[PDB]
Short mmCIF file of C-alpha atoms in Angstrom, two decimals:
data_model
loop_
_atom_site.label_atom_id
_atom_site.label_comp_id
_atom_site.label_asym_id
_atom_site.label_seq_id
_atom_site.Cartn_x
_atom_site.Cartn_y
_atom_site.Cartn_z
CA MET A 1 60.45 129.05 154.01
CA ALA A 2 57.60 130.66 152.08
CA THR A 3 59.78 133.59 150.94
CA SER A 4 62.78 131.38 150.12
CA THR A 5 64.44 131.54 146.70
CA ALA A 6 67.08 128.97 147.66
CA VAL A 7 68.19 126.20 145.30
CA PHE A 8 68.15 122.67 146.70
CA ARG A 9 70.25 119.78 145.37
CA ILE A 10 69.14 116.21 146.08
CA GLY A 11 70.13 112.78 144.78
CA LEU A 12 67.58 110.19 143.76
CA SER A 13 67.70 106.61 142.57
CA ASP A 14 66.18 106.40 139.10
CA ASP A 15 63.30 104.19 140.24
CA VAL A 16 62.54 106.30 143.34
CA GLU A 17 62.32 109.39 141.10
CA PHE A 18 59.16 108.08 139.41
CA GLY A 19 57.02 107.86 142.55
CA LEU A 20 58.60 110.40 144.90
CA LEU A 21 59.17 113.38 142.61
CA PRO A 22 55.65 114.27 141.30
CA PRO A 23 53.91 114.52 144.70
CA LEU A 24 57.01 116.11 146.25
CA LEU A 25 57.30 118.87 143.62
CA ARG A 26 53.69 119.90 144.24
CA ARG A 27 54.28 120.41 147.97
CA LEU A 28 57.39 122.60 147.69
CA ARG A 29 55.73 124.62 144.92
CA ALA A 30 52.57 125.29 146.93
CA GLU A 31 54.34 126.39 150.12
CA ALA A 32 57.68 127.71 148.78
CA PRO A 33 57.10 128.93 145.22
CA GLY A 34 60.53 130.57 144.90
CA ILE A 35 62.61 127.45 145.59
CA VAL A 36 64.35 125.61 142.75
CA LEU A 37 65.01 121.86 142.92
CA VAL A 38 67.97 120.18 141.22
CA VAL A 39 67.84 116.37 141.17
CA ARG A 40 71.03 114.41 140.54
CA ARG A 41 71.16 110.71 139.68
CA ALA A 42 72.23 108.59 142.67
CA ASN A 43 73.20 104.96 143.22
CA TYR A 44 74.97 103.12 146.01
CA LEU A 45 78.36 103.68 144.33
CA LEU A 46 77.99 107.42 143.62
CA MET A 47 76.23 108.12 146.93
CA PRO A 48 79.31 108.80 149.12
CA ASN A 49 80.82 110.88 146.30
CA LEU A 50 77.70 113.03 145.94
CA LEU A 51 77.58 113.76 149.68
CA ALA A 52 81.30 114.24 150.35
CA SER A 53 81.74 116.55 147.33
CA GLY A 54 78.71 118.76 148.03
CA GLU A 55 76.76 117.85 144.89
CA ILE A 56 73.68 116.99 146.99
CA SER A 57 72.57 117.78 150.52
CA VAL A 58 70.37 114.68 150.83
CA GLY A 59 69.75 111.55 148.80
CA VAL A 60 67.09 108.87 148.59
CA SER A 61 68.83 105.86 147.09
CA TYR A 62 69.91 102.32 147.61
CA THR A 63 72.89 102.64 149.93
CA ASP A 64 75.73 100.37 150.97
CA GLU A 65 78.43 102.31 152.86
CA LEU A 66 78.36 106.04 153.61
CA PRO A 67 81.02 108.48 154.83
CA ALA A 68 81.54 108.76 158.57
CA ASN A 69 80.32 112.39 158.44
CA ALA A 70 76.90 111.29 157.18
CA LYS A 71 73.56 110.56 158.84
CA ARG A 72 71.16 108.03 157.36
CA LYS A 73 67.59 106.80 157.80
CA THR A 74 66.17 103.57 156.42
CA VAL A 75 63.09 104.29 154.32
CA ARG A 76 62.42 100.79 152.92
CA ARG A 77 63.87 97.30 153.27
CA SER A 78 64.54 95.45 150.02
CA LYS A 79 64.30 91.87 148.83
CA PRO A 80 65.57 90.59 145.47
CA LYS A 81 63.25 89.84 142.56
CA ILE A 82 63.73 88.08 139.23
CA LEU A 83 62.31 89.82 136.16
CA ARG A 84 61.58 87.89 132.98
CA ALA A 85 59.69 88.44 129.74
CA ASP A 86 59.32 84.94 128.26
CA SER A 87 56.07 82.97 128.20
CA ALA A 88 57.28 79.63 129.58
CA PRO A 89 55.04 78.37 132.42
CA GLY A 90 56.41 77.82 135.89
CA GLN A 91 58.92 79.54 138.11
CA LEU A 92 62.61 79.42 137.24
CA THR A 93 64.64 76.80 139.05
CA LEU A 94 68.26 77.45 139.99
CA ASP A 95 69.28 75.41 136.93
CA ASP A 96 67.05 77.50 134.66
CA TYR A 97 68.47 80.67 136.21
CA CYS A 98 72.11 79.70 135.66
CA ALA A 99 71.45 78.63 132.05
CA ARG A 100 69.65 81.71 130.79
CA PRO A 101 71.34 85.00 129.83
CA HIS A 102 71.26 87.87 132.28
CA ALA A 103 70.94 91.64 132.29
CA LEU A 104 72.83 93.37 135.09
CA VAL A 105 72.09 96.81 136.51
CA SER A 106 75.73 97.86 136.91
CA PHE A 107 76.44 101.48 137.80
CA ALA A 108 80.13 101.40 136.81
CA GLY A 109 80.35 98.99 133.85
CA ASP A 110 81.17 95.76 135.68
CA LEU A 111 79.96 92.57 134.00
CA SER A 112 79.62 90.74 137.33
CA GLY A 113 77.70 91.56 140.48
CA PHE A 114 76.76 90.29 143.92
CA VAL A 115 74.62 87.52 142.40
CA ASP A 116 77.76 86.25 140.66
CA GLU A 117 79.63 86.54 143.96
CA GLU A 118 76.98 84.44 145.70
CA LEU A 119 76.73 81.83 142.93
CA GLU A 120 80.52 81.42 142.95
CA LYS A 121 80.40 80.37 146.61
CA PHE A 122 78.48 77.26 145.52
CA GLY A 123 80.49 76.58 142.36
CA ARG A 124 77.82 77.98 140.03
CA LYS A 125 77.95 80.76 137.45
CA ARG A 126 75.84 82.64 134.92
CA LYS A 127 76.39 84.53 131.67
CA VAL A 128 75.70 88.27 131.66
CA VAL A 129 75.03 89.61 128.16
CA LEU A 130 73.96 93.17 129.02
CA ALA A 131 74.99 95.73 131.62
CA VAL A 132 72.81 98.83 131.91
CA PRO A 133 73.37 101.82 134.25
CA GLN A 134 69.76 102.23 135.45
CA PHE A 135 66.52 100.42 136.26
CA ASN A 136 63.93 102.23 134.14
CA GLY A 137 63.54 101.08 130.54
CA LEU A 138 64.77 97.57 131.41
CA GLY A 139 61.48 96.04 130.28
CA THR A 140 61.96 97.43 126.78
CA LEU A 141 65.36 95.72 126.67
CA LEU A 142 64.16 92.30 127.88
CA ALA A 143 60.97 92.17 125.78
CA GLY A 144 60.86 89.29 123.31
CA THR A 145 64.01 87.71 124.78
CA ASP A 146 64.88 85.13 127.41
CA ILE A 147 67.20 87.57 129.20
CA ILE A 148 66.38 87.91 132.90
CA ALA A 149 67.31 90.58 135.45
CA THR A 150 67.72 90.43 139.23
CA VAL A 151 66.69 93.72 140.84
CA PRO A 152 65.53 95.05 144.23
CA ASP A 153 61.81 94.61 144.83
CA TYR A 154 61.21 98.37 144.79
CA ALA A 155 62.69 98.59 141.30
CA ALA A 156 60.75 95.45 140.35
CA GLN A 157 57.51 97.16 141.40
CA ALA A 158 58.14 100.11 139.08
CA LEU A 159 59.21 97.82 136.23
CA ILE A 160 56.18 95.57 136.68
CA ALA A 161 54.04 98.72 136.61
CA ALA A 162 55.71 99.53 133.27
CA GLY A 163 54.20 96.30 131.92
CA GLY A 164 55.29 93.24 130.00
CA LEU A 165 57.33 91.50 132.72
CA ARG A 166 56.86 88.74 135.28
CA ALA A 167 58.32 89.03 138.78
CA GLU A 168 59.17 86.11 141.05
CA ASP A 169 61.30 85.32 144.07
CA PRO A 170 64.78 84.08 143.10
CA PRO A 171 65.57 80.36 143.50
CA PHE A 172 68.41 81.35 145.85
CA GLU A 173 69.34 84.07 148.34
CA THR A 174 71.23 87.20 147.32
CA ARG A 175 71.87 90.75 148.53
CA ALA A 176 69.33 93.57 148.28
CA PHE A 177 70.44 96.97 149.55
CA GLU A 178 68.11 99.06 151.68
CA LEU A 179 66.49 102.19 150.35
CA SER A 180 67.86 104.97 152.57
CA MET A 181 67.62 108.67 153.12
CA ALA A 182 71.16 109.87 153.75
CA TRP A 183 72.57 113.31 154.45
CA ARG A 184 75.80 114.83 155.72
CA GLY A 185 76.35 115.41 159.42
CA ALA A 186 77.02 119.13 158.98
CA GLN A 187 73.47 119.72 157.69
CA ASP A 188 71.64 117.83 160.45
CA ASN A 189 71.30 121.20 162.25
CA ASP A 190 70.29 123.27 159.23
CA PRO A 191 66.64 124.40 159.36
CA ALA A 192 66.32 124.73 155.58
CA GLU A 193 67.74 121.23 155.16
CA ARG A 194 65.70 119.81 158.04
CA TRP A 195 62.70 121.33 156.26
CA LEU A 196 63.53 119.72 152.91
CA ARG A 197 64.19 116.32 154.50
CA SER A 198 60.94 116.47 156.48
CA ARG A 199 59.19 117.27 153.19
CA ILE A 200 60.77 114.26 151.45
CA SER A 201 59.77 112.00 154.35
CA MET A 202 56.16 113.18 153.99
CA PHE A 203 56.05 111.20 150.73
CA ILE A 204 58.17 108.12 151.50
CA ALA B 1 77.85 87.79 113.03
CA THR B 2 79.44 85.00 115.09
CA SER B 3 81.09 87.52 117.43
CA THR B 4 80.92 87.07 121.21
CA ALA B 5 83.00 90.15 122.04
CA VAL B 6 82.28 92.72 124.76
CA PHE B 7 81.50 96.28 123.69
CA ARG B 8 81.42 99.27 126.05
CA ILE B 9 79.45 102.33 124.95
CA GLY B 10 78.53 105.62 126.59
CA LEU B 11 75.10 107.18 126.13
CA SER B 12 73.42 110.31 127.42
CA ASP B 13 70.07 109.92 129.16
CA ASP B 14 68.04 111.01 126.11
CA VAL B 15 69.84 108.53 123.86
CA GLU B 16 69.57 105.61 126.29
CA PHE B 17 65.88 106.43 126.71
CA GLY B 18 64.78 106.84 123.10
CA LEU B 19 67.41 105.21 120.88
CA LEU B 20 69.00 102.33 122.80
CA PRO B 21 65.98 99.96 122.42
CA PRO B 22 65.93 100.14 118.60
CA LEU B 23 69.73 99.98 118.49
CA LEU B 24 69.87 96.93 120.76
CA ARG B 25 67.18 95.10 118.77
CA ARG B 26 69.27 95.62 115.62
CA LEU B 27 72.58 94.72 117.28
CA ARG B 28 71.20 91.46 118.68
CA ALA B 29 69.58 90.55 115.35
CA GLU B 30 72.91 90.71 113.50
CA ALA B 31 75.27 89.44 116.24
CA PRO B 32 73.22 87.55 118.86
CA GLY B 33 76.29 86.58 120.90
CA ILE B 34 77.72 90.03 121.67
CA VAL B 35 77.89 91.36 125.23
CA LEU B 36 77.00 95.04 125.59
CA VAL B 37 78.00 97.35 128.45
CA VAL B 38 76.17 100.69 128.54
CA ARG B 39 77.59 103.52 130.65
CA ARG B 40 75.50 106.58 131.51
CA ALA B 41 77.27 109.85 130.75
CA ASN B 42 75.87 113.28 129.96
CA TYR B 43 77.56 115.55 127.41
CA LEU B 44 80.10 116.80 129.97
CA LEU B 45 80.98 113.47 131.60
CA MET B 46 81.21 111.49 128.33
CA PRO B 47 84.71 112.62 127.22
CA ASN B 48 86.19 111.47 130.54
CA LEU B 49 84.90 107.93 130.02
CA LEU B 50 86.40 107.91 126.51
CA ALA B 51 89.80 109.17 127.70
CA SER B 52 89.88 106.74 130.63
CA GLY B 53 88.98 103.75 128.45
CA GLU B 54 85.73 103.05 130.29
CA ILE B 55 83.99 103.17 126.89
CA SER B 56 85.25 102.79 123.33
CA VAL B 57 82.58 104.98 121.71
CA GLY B 58 80.27 107.67 123.05
CA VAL B 59 77.10 109.29 121.77
CA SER B 60 76.18 112.71 123.12
CA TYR B 61 75.82 116.37 122.26
CA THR B 62 79.00 118.04 121.03
CA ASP B 63 81.57 118.49 123.78
CA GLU B 64 85.32 118.33 124.40
CA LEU B 65 87.16 115.66 122.46
CA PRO B 66 90.16 114.02 124.17
CA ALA B 67 93.49 113.84 122.39
CA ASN B 68 93.73 111.19 119.65
CA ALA B 69 89.92 111.07 119.54
CA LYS B 70 87.64 111.45 116.51
CA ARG B 71 83.99 112.43 116.15
CA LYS B 72 81.22 112.26 113.57
CA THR B 73 77.73 113.75 113.45
CA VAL B 74 75.14 110.97 113.61
CA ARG B 75 71.79 112.81 114.00
CA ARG B 76 70.71 116.36 113.28
CA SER B 77 69.17 118.57 115.95
CA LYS B 78 65.36 118.64 116.12
CA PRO B 79 64.09 119.81 119.52
CA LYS B 80 60.46 119.58 120.55
CA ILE B 81 58.43 121.36 123.23
CA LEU B 82 56.45 119.10 125.55
CA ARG B 83 53.34 120.31 127.36
CA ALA B 84 50.60 118.79 129.52
CA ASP B 85 48.03 121.62 129.35
CA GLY B 86 46.62 126.20 120.13
CA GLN B 87 50.40 126.16 119.67
CA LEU B 88 52.60 128.05 122.11
CA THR B 89 53.86 131.40 120.84
CA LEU B 90 57.35 132.61 121.71
CA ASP B 91 56.01 134.91 124.43
CA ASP B 92 54.13 131.98 125.97
CA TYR B 93 57.33 129.92 125.83
CA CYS B 94 59.32 132.59 127.69
CA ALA B 95 56.50 133.03 130.24
CA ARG B 96 55.83 129.40 131.16
CA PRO B 97 57.97 127.62 133.77
CA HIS B 98 60.59 125.26 132.39
CA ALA B 99 61.87 121.89 133.55
CA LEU B 100 65.48 121.24 132.54
CA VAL B 101 66.46 117.62 131.88
CA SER B 102 69.94 116.15 132.37
CA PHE B 103 72.28 119.15 132.28
CA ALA B 104 74.77 117.85 134.86
CA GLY B 105 73.34 119.78 137.83
CA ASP B 106 73.22 123.24 136.26
CA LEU B 107 70.17 125.48 135.99
CA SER B 108 71.00 126.55 132.41
CA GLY B 109 70.64 124.69 129.14
CA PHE B 110 71.02 125.17 125.39
CA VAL B 111 67.69 127.01 125.17
CA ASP B 112 69.01 129.70 127.52
CA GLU B 113 71.84 130.41 125.08
CA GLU B 114 69.41 130.53 122.14
CA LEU B 115 66.91 132.86 123.84
CA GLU B 116 69.69 135.35 124.63
CA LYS B 117 70.18 135.94 120.90
CA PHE B 118 66.71 137.55 120.84
CA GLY B 119 67.30 139.39 124.12
CA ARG B 120 64.91 137.01 125.89
CA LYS B 121 65.08 134.80 128.96
CA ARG B 122 63.13 132.04 130.68
CA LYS B 123 62.60 130.72 134.21
CA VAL B 124 63.88 127.22 134.94
CA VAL B 125 62.01 125.90 137.99
CA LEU B 126 63.28 122.30 138.06
CA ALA B 127 66.23 120.16 136.94
CA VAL B 128 65.91 116.37 136.68
CA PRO B 129 68.40 113.81 135.31
CA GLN B 130 66.06 111.57 133.30
CA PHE B 131 63.50 111.83 130.52
CA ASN B 132 61.49 108.72 131.42
CA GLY B 133 58.47 109.73 133.47
CA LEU B 134 58.40 113.34 132.26
CA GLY B 135 54.71 112.92 131.46
CA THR B 136 53.71 112.11 135.03
CA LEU B 137 56.08 114.89 136.12
CA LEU B 138 54.43 117.66 134.06
CA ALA B 139 50.88 116.31 134.49
CA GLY B 140 48.43 118.94 135.67
CA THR B 141 51.06 121.70 135.47
CA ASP B 142 51.98 124.53 133.13
CA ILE B 143 55.63 123.40 133.23
CA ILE B 144 57.07 122.70 129.78
CA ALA B 145 60.24 120.93 128.67
CA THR B 146 62.34 121.06 125.50
CA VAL B 147 63.72 117.66 124.49
CA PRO B 148 65.22 116.05 121.38
CA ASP B 149 62.68 114.67 118.94
CA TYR B 150 63.51 111.00 119.57
CA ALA B 151 62.80 111.48 123.29
CA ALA B 152 59.56 113.34 122.51
CA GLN B 153 58.42 110.52 120.22
CA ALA B 154 58.74 107.97 123.03
CA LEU B 155 57.19 110.29 125.62
CA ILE B 156 54.18 111.15 123.44
CA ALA B 157 53.70 107.43 122.74
CA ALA B 158 53.11 106.88 126.47
CA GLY B 159 50.25 109.40 126.43
CA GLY B 160 49.44 112.51 128.43
CA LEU B 161 51.57 115.08 126.57
CA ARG B 162 51.60 117.23 123.44
CA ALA B 163 54.68 117.89 121.30
CA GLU B 164 55.36 120.99 119.20
CA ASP B 165 58.23 122.60 117.36
CA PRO B 166 59.93 125.41 119.32
CA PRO B 167 59.50 129.05 118.21
CA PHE B 168 63.21 129.36 117.33
CA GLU B 169 66.04 127.08 116.34
CA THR B 170 69.20 125.46 117.33
CA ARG B 171 71.76 122.94 116.22
CA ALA B 172 72.52 122.41 119.91
CA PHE B 173 70.74 119.03 120.04
CA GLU B 174 72.79 117.42 117.25
CA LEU B 175 74.07 113.97 118.21
CA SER B 176 77.75 113.21 117.64
CA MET B 177 79.53 109.89 117.97
CA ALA B 178 83.07 110.01 119.37
CA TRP B 179 85.80 107.38 119.63
CA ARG B 180 89.53 107.03 120.25
CA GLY B 181 91.85 107.07 117.25
CA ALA B 182 93.64 103.98 118.55
CA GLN B 183 90.46 101.95 117.97
CA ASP B 184 89.97 103.58 114.54
CA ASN B 185 91.39 100.41 112.93
CA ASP B 186 89.78 97.64 115.02
CA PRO B 187 87.34 95.85 112.66
CA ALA B 188 85.05 94.93 115.56
CA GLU B 189 84.95 98.54 116.77
CA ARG B 190 84.37 99.84 113.25
CA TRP B 191 81.51 97.36 112.82
CA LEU B 192 79.98 98.70 116.04
CA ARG B 193 80.43 102.36 115.07
CA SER B 194 79.00 101.47 111.65
CA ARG B 195 75.83 100.04 113.19
CA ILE B 196 75.42 102.89 115.69
CA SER B 197 75.79 105.38 112.83
CA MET B 198 73.24 103.58 110.64
CA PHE B 199 70.62 102.95 113.31
CA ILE B 200 71.34 106.49 114.57
#
């Protein structure tokens, strides 16, 4: 692989890109200086599209369902986290949660999510005032407001690292998709792709 | 001011990164009850979201405009070079490795078209979809990136990088706001386009 000038196309969740990419880039550069990396944005909705269409060979993303012609590997289990920016003492109760306005990380413009689906089961609801298509930058949008966001704990970690937010366990149970490495069945055999995937796994 | 309506806007990665926070602060200050949906769309994907009705207004580099649609320039082009290592000469610029940001999966960008006019070329070694975290990405490397000035301002504010003017020029980073002609009369939509235009 040292003499390779091949171009590689991978898909990454926007939060995963912060931690995975810098150490990864250094490894491929040092051992395969001719290879070019193209990173596409990935989420659990675009993930089957990116694989089935050929836009990426492998992705590291939150994943829900994948095409039948796709292999996958869990890289990290997720639990939900509440993010807030106000200064009120104490953890949010369920009543507090349902009364405050919410920011939703929605990858296709929906104003409701799985949290709303779960709250509806118990006859409760919430008001979403903001839908954003990514995780990063969310702290700049919540700052100085009482808007709260419900995100996977991996995204929460990166957003807490960005500063200005508090993280807590939600006052109820909701979904949190796994972080996965997923690739298409055809490329399980490929040595160049096996090599890239083994290099990604060296850092996550 | 008392509006509680839902607005759906499309923004490229550079605009969502550097300009959405000031825009949102101003939108919420005037109309605290509005609901905002932001869709991510680069300069090639944007027109599809406008034609399909997924958004009512988009902000991106100049692209294809669907039928019935209108556009207006909202910010002039001012690119900046970012570096983590004096000012870079043109020969240094064409010799350093380049990271390309959010060009829909391609290995070419606007700068490649500009350099060709001098019979020059560059080497793109990396393509990423986001501007946030570029500092930690270029840290300890000779890789440079060429971003719009509003993205450079936010990235320099986080520390670790230096920003310079490029050794050539380009209108290619001009921001244009596009919308459908059917919504050209909606007072709520025209309020929104008015505020986007003002707060650039």
